[PDB]
C-alpha cells in the first residue's frame, strides 16, 4: 500500500511538472 501511493504520487508530481514545462515553451 505504501509503496503504491509513494509511485502514484511521484507520477502525479511527474504530470504537473510536464504540465509546466510544456506551458513554458509555448511561451516560446
Ligand atoms: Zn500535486
Ligand atoms: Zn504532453
Ligand atoms: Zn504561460
Known amino acids: 500500500r505504501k509503496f503504491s501511493e509513494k509511485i502514484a504520487l511521484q507520477?502525479?508530481?511527474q504530470?504537473?511538472?510536464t504540465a509546466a514545462f510544456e506551458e513554458?515553451?509555448?511561451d516560446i
Open 24 to 26: 513554458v515553451m509555448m
Open 15 to 17: 504530470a504537473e511538472e
Open 11 to 13: 507520477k502525479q508530481r
